[PDB]
Design a protein around this ligand. Structure first.
Ligand SMILES: Cc1cnccc1N1CCC(C(=O)NC2(C#N)CC2)CC1
Ligand SMILES: Cc1cnccc1N1CCC(C(=O)NC2(C#N)CC2)CC1
Lengths: 304, 304
């Protein structure tokens, strides 16, 4: 037992990280087959980032201006193209460590692992969630751009995020691996403010189920509620509305614990209204929302 | 910016995980060079675990009773020996993926990454700390034993933990890679209660420095204190005493922020006495103690 914020094992993604340099800008690339994917802003000077015309800046760049290094070995760039906000650098060598992989675009509330990298070299791995305002709360310094987010289903890596930007408020924005930003964000150094960072209700409920499975039971109360009544309280507390789809997803955890989803919603309603009174759940003094129901089942069942 | 509970990239350790089966017991082993290390309780029947005589149980075991599988390939066991609470299974094949490595015995308050495994297959990676009572708060199900804890210095893996036991209170105990338990724990299914789980003060202070570096500044107050005055409050709150050695270790973070260590201790003293008043620091409503000062510098500087 015990319940931890757990990342996927990072080895399959470590095998794909490379360094990409263009002029004086270095960041990370993702090497899959004979393509390296990286943020298009690799071509920007610090001055360029204010109002960059990427099509115009890219005209001044040739294949030989993209320096791609895998470990301490140089890869030969034989083509480049821009797709949305990513560059695809065709290299003459397929990555021999390419895992089975997919590109997926996740929904707000979905969790993934980030392999934070600098100069193509892995620094650390952590779990986060796509927030309801399409930001992520990461840990990214200068040269972390092109670090990726992913999920693993057995031996298949689903890449869902590539890091591009830090907003003036220190939260993070990026793209899927087709180069489309999550949410309204752009790869320019300009006024971009995030909307409300609401709490991912379905994920809190999953985590409360994890708490019961792991013996933390004090918050269970004698009440129930309805989706509509719960949602009036969720709204007041900047929680995402709970849908019947979410109730259905929490079905397997409902079955495992014998606690009806709406009973757990009524326990959550009291926690919101009453607070924790100085108590902890799974070692947290706040209600954790970066575990999906699938995460809780996966971790509570030991999937590899 | 941003500050996350970050594990080391797990790839170098994934390359070392194997499955070890003895009779009807399966758990994990660590394959380094031509030795597989695993908990000696692999030889126990559930009945054996109550009062096991490991020397006597081991007499009934031969090399061929230890089944070691690396991926879906069988390794030939050509020797076995017991060292403290681990078995060393000599195999006829050096692990071709053996990283540079060391075995280290860590001190309470030191952090490390765990690669949670089942049947030799990696499930997830998370960061934890050696608690002052020599437990760890992990996430371990049946068949997680032999999962390891480690730190990485560039390309050298320092293995510091191997998982053996879950106490009746759901906290975890294990050994270094010489098979010596951390703290007073034994590999028997008997009454073993943990002592006080005190808070790792030096680590809280490091994390408060991380908070200031990442813009969370509200808790900084107009006060200072002395080690002796602080330690009277630490004692009252089940915090570890702060030593001049800890003050020296927090030196580089003191330098980076311009906040004297004793001023930060006085901010911590007020947080202990006043609580958070519903506020958060780096997204936590409690004072986080599983980042060492070295962790905070490493993450705030982007070491790979
Ligand atoms: C910190 C960070 C995190 N994640 C992605 C990017 C990040 N930074 C964005 C601003 C960059 C910068 O300082 N640019 C200027 C210059 N010269 C204009 C000031 C540094 C990197
Ligand atoms: C859950 C866990 C976590 N970390 C390490 C070990 C862990 N378990 C220890 C008790 C085991 C067990 O059920 N043994 C009996 C039988 N049959 C006597 C009941 C199961 C594995």
């Amino acid at each position: 037992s015990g319940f931890r914020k757990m990342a996927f094992p990072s080895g399959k993604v470590e095998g794909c990280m490379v360094q990409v340099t263009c002029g004086t800008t270095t960041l990370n690339g993702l090497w899959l087959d004979d393509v390296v994917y990286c943020p298009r802003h690799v071509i920007c000077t610090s001055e360029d980032m204010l109002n960059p015309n990427y099509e115009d800046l890219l005209i001044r760049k040739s294949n030989h201006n993209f320096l791609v290094q895998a470990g301490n070995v140089q890869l030969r760039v034989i083509g480049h193209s821009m797709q949305n906000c990513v560059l695809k650098l065709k290299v003459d060598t397929a990555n021999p460590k390419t895992p089975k992989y997919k590109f997926v675009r996740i929904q707000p509330g979905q969790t993934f692992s980030v392999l934070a990298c600098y100069n193509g070299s892995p620094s650390g791995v952590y779990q986060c969630a796509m927030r309801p305002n399409f930001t992520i709360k990461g840990s990214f310094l200068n040269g972390s751009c092109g670090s990726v987010g992913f999920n693993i289903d057995y031996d298949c890596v689903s890449f869902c995020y590539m890091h591009h930007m830090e907003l003036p408020t220190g939260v993070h924005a990026g793209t899927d691996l087709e180069g489309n930003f999550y949410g309204p964000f752009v790869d320019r150094q300009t006024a971009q403010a995030a909307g409300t960072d609401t709490t991912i209700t379905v994920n809190v409920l999953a985590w409360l189920y994890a708490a019961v499975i792991n013996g933390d039971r004090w918050f269970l109360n004698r009440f129930t509620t309805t989706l509509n009544d719960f949602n009036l309280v969720a709204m007041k507390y900047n929680y995402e509305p709970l849908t019947q789809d979410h109730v259905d997803i929490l079905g397997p955890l409902s079955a495992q614990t014998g606690i009806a989803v709406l009973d757990m919603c009524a326990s959550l309603k009291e926690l919101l209204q009453n607070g924790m009174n100085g108590r902890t759940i799974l070692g947290s003094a706040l209600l954790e929302d970066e575990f999906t129901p699938f995460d809780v089942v996966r971790q509570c069942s030991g999937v590899t």
